[PDB]
């Protein structure tokens, strides 16, 4: 259903930008979806997963790396897991986890709400490090029970968002973003983090307009946000969603007024140039750089199907915006406004006319695209006559219905 082949991915920077379980998931995705580079990706993934005492996903990654190494031993014609890791890691993890559990349950006999919440948050962090998702969720819920202050509520919301991101329970993420935003009277920028979380959750849920709007409000002062999404990928996500959904004036207004996506596009000059060419009717370079960004971000944690749909919408909107200022546009020139051939452009234009929102006619003789501007009166008179014929026909039918009821006509 997925998995493509493409070189030139920078593994080191993409691995270092993220950190935590998010980095592990992204490295696993990169290894699984990018062949001819799965070896080094899996090696780095196993090197980092061994850190912070993982248990089951470590076994899966070790098996995958062993399979990859075995594959490498046959093409140009498997590493050991060091099972002592199991022993030492299990012993240390059990000792520290039981010590922390003893401390927390002793605090439960002391009955302090804030202390219980903090201990349960620590237990959830320890379980997440161990690779225990449901256990961390339960700990963070027993923490959410014992909340005292607004900052405690904010921390609870952030923890629940982080956990449900891995659990892919994005409904919980959205609910907790709404709770953390609407409640506390909507230098420390927490709303930026909440908006980033909401935007990424919406994008993961196949939403593009609201996700773009939420990302647009994210300020660059947040800077460090590696547990969920890197700033470069945030800029890419926002630019792609805005290009797909926001039309030209909306694009300009939002990008300029935000003043943080200016910096974000400075981090990612490719998206900035693509948007500028979109505004300036340079769709050929826009779409070739779009294909470059395609091959570059086809192996992203939460992008691939969403970004494919986004690119389809982007090319449709580009065609619509390109033909809009013309009443009689040569299809030769329109095809020359991209690397596509005449036949493919004609097929795409026919599909757009069938779907709509281009209002055009294809004079395939000279290959010139003529816009359709029909007089309202001619259409109005035609459909008014059709309505009258339908009204008379329905008048007959209702007139007929009175016959079978006044004369009691039915199946016996």
């Amino acid at each position: 259903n997925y998995v493509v082949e493409n070189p030139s991915l920078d593994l080191e920077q993409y691995a270092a930008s993220y950190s935590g379980l998010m980095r592990i998931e992204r490295l696993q995705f990169i290894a699984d979806h990018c062949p001819t580079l799965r070896v080094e990706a899996l090696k780095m993934a196993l090197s980092f997963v061994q850190r912070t005492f993982n248990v089951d996903m470590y076994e899966e990654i070790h098996r995958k790396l062993s399979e990859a190494t075995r594959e490498l031993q046959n093409a140009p014609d498997p590493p050991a897991l060091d099972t002592a890791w199991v022993e030492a890691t299990r012993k240390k993890a059990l000792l520290k986890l039981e010590k922390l559990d003893t401390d927390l349950k002793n605090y439960k006999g002391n009955s302090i709400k804030e202390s219980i919440r903090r201990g349960h948050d620590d237990l959830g962090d320890h379980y997440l490090d161990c690779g225990d998702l449901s256990n961390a969720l339960k700990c963070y819920s027993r923490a959410r029970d014992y909340c005292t202050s607004a900052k405690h509520v904010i921390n609870m919301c952030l923890n629940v968002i982080k956990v449900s991101v891995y659990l892919q329970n994005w409904s919980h993420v959205l609910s907790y973003v709404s709770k953390a935003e609407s409640t506390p009277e909507i230098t420390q920028a927490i709303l930026t983090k909440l908006k980033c979380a909401a935007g990424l959750a919406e994008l993961a849920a196949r939403k593009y307009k609201q996700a773009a709007k939420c990302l647009l409000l994210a300020s660059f002062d947040h800077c460090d946000f590696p547990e969920l999404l890197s700033p470069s990928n945030v800029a890419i996500y926002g630019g792609l969603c805005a290009l797909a959904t926001f039309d030209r004036q909306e694009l300009q207004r939002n990008v300029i007024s935000s003043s943080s996506f200016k910096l974000f596009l400075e981090l990612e000059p490719q998206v900035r140039d693509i948007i500028f060419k979109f505004y300036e009717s340079k769709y050929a370079s826009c779409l070739k750089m779009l294909d470059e960004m395609k091959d570059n971000l086809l192996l992203d944690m939460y992008l691939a199907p969403h970004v494919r749909t986004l690119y389809t919408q982007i090319r449709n909107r580009a065609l619509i915006q390109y033909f809009s200022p013309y009443v009689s546009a040569d299809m030769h020139r329109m095809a020359a406004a991209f690397n596509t051939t005449v036949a493919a452009l004609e097929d795409e234009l026919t599909q757009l006319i069938l779907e709509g929102l281009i209002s055009a006619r294809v004079d395939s003789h000279s290959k010139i695209l003529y816009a359709r501007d029909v007089d309202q009166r001619s259409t109005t008179f035609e459909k008014s006559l059709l309505m009258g014929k339908e009204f008379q026909r329905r008048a007959k039918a209702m007139m007929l219905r009175a016959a079978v009821l006044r004369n009691q006509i039915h199946v016996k």
């Binding site: 993220y18 980095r23 460090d224």
Partner: protein, 556 residues
């Protein structure tokens, strides 16, 4: 034998504890200065290996419902009883001595072993002599020897503690007569003995005839007798006769503490045996010899080094799983004793010592922090980690040094000074060149940032707050030098290695002058004694003992 404990041993434990706390079925009660402790006989002997005679021997004690046990603290006996009943010890850092005394009053190997391990691990900076006397009072041979070495080192360090004055004669003889004194001079032990002896009266003068003969004869012909002349009791004649006899005999021999040769500790060197990846070695600037050191974890690498003004070596972090473990190098046993681990698993941490505290700046804490730019320090006295003000900006491959009791961290182009008294960062000067993958040295009152990607020599002064160039190190072209700047013999020098194409690496150190801006040829390290080191090796300055360490065998 089948000894299953699944969901039962804890249940029977709970029955024990519940029916103890309810004062149920009681048959024996301990009277402790009027405090009553109704409890199980069987639990009493299970903890205390002495009680097993207190209620089995056919003496009148067996048929006695009320037993008056004295010379035991009520709090310690209660904590012993509850530790017997629930299994939780929950020992604090203050009542360890009395708890150990009460446990020994029972002579077992459970609570006593636990407290022995705790005391061995808790000899931080000051209680060394106190717990050494404690172990002299109660036989704790393992802790006795550990405290012996620790007291040797720390007492040689401070030699002014009041607890040292109240010591037994045999313990003092063992301490001073040992050849493990970490003293660079022979007169400090002499004056320590003089102040110990002049602390009291004739009773200590009796021990004087036995402790005065444990010092090398160079200090026994000194002004010591001139000071004893005014300090000796009247009408004493044979005392002078026996004092005069302590000049010629008793094998005057050199000590071990004078061998504090200033050497260089290296980590992650090119291992000789292919079965090993990296190794830790040492170099002697004066002896022109290459010594080796044992790897602290023997399997973990990518560690950071720090040297306190008291010449101590510490290792933190490292990876390839990253472990937040901590270690300390023994200057005599050639081993590594672990310490309190860090709360975060760092990759190549930069440890800096200031005001007696170890500061770890950067080094990939978790990376996924809300604020990636954070630091964490260490307490060498309390043996704990204390969170401090976080870093201003996120940096990678950075270096940090200490100048004028202030924390200075260096990155690509920015520098921040951490004020330990207020726990805050203050903006410093900006460097005109962006160079990374380099280290800095704290020589005097100037910071020398050498290398970066090269041969960039950018000198910074704290009193002037400016960055300036001096010169370029003379190095052969078509090469990538590996610069290492460190203070040697109170003189700024460098240790650089040059590598070319199809050429062998050469090791050479140069003497740099402040006003000359030139690296004069000081000494060239011959390849007959030192082999290739590598690329990720680190260098630091410290004092080591040639006898405790071993020479690294390698063919010239």
């Amino acid at each position: 034998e089948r000894q299953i404990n699944t969901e039962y041993a804890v249940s029977l434990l709970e029955q024990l504890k519940l029916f103890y706390e309810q004062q149920l079925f009681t048959d024996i009660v301990l009277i402790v200065e009027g405090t009553e402790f109704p409890c199980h006989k069987m639990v009493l002997a299970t903890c205390s290996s002495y009680f097993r005679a207190m209620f089995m021997s056919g003496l009148s004690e067996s048929k006695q419902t009320h037993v008056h046990l004295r010379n035991v603290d009520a709090a310690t006996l209660q904590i012993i009883i509850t530790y017997a009943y629930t299994g939780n010890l929950a020992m604090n850092d203050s009542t360890v001595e009395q708890l150990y005394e009460t446990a020994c009053f029972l002579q077992v190997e459970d609570v006593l072993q636990r407290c022995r391990e705790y005391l061995i691990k808790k000899i931080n900076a000051e209680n060394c002599v106190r717990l050494l006397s404690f172990a002299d009072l109660f036989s704790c041979e393992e802790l006795k020897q550990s405290a012996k070495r620790m007291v040797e080192h720390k007492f040689t360090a401070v030699y002014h503690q009041d607890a040292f004055m109240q010591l037994s004669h045999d313990l003092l003889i063992d301490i001073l007569s040992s050849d493990n004194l970490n003293v660079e001079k022979e007169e400090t032990v002499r004056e320590a003995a003089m102040l110990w002896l002049e602390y009291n009266t004739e009773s200590r003068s009796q021990y004087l005839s036995s402790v005065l003969s444990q010092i090398r004869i160079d200090a026994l012909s000194e002004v010591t007798q001139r000071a004893w002349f005014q300090g000796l009791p009247p009408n004493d004649k044979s005392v002078v006769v026996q004092g005069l006899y302590k000049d010629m005999p008793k094998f005057f021999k050199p000590r071990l503490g004078m061998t504090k040769e200033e050497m260089m500790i290296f980590i992650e060197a090119s291992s000789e045996n292919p079965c090993s990846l990296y190794s830790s070695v040492c170099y002697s600037p004066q002896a022109e010899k290459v010594y080796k050191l044992c790897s602290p974890p023997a399997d973990l690498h990518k560690v950071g080094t720090v040297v306190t003004p008291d010449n101590d070596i510490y290792i933190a972090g490292g990876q390839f799983r990253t472990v937040n473990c901590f270690y300390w190098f023994d200057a005599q046993q050639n081993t590594w004793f672990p310490k309190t681990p860090m709360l975060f698993v760092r990759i190549k941490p930069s440890l800096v010592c200031c005001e007696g505290y170890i500061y770890a700046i950067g080094g990939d804490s978790v990376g996924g922090e809300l604020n990636r730019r954070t630091v964490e320090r260490y307490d060498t006295e309390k043996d704990e980690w204390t969170m401090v003000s976080p870093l201003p900006c996120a940096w990678q491959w950075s270096a940090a040094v200490v100048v004028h009791d202030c924390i200075y961290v260096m990155t690509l182009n920015l520098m921040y000074c951490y004020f330990p008294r207020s726990d805050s960062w203050v903006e410093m000067a900006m460097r005109q060149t962006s160079r990374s993958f380099a280290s800095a040295a704290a020589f005097g009152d100037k910071i020398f940032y050498i290398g970066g990607l090269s041969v960039t020599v950018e000198i910074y002064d704290v009193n002037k707050n400016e960055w300036k160039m001096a010169a370029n190190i003379p190095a052969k072209r078509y090469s990538d030098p590996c610069v290492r700047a460190v203070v040697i013999s109170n003189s700024l020098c460098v240790f650089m290695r040059e590598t070319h194409l199809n050429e062998r690496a050469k090791y050479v150190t140069y003497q740099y002058d402040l006003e000359l801006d030139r690296w004069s040829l000081r000494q060239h390290i011959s390849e007959r004694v030192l082999w290739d080191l590598g690329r990720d090796f680190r260098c630091t300055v410290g004092k080591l003992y040639p006898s405790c360490l071993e020479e690294s065998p390698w063919k010239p």
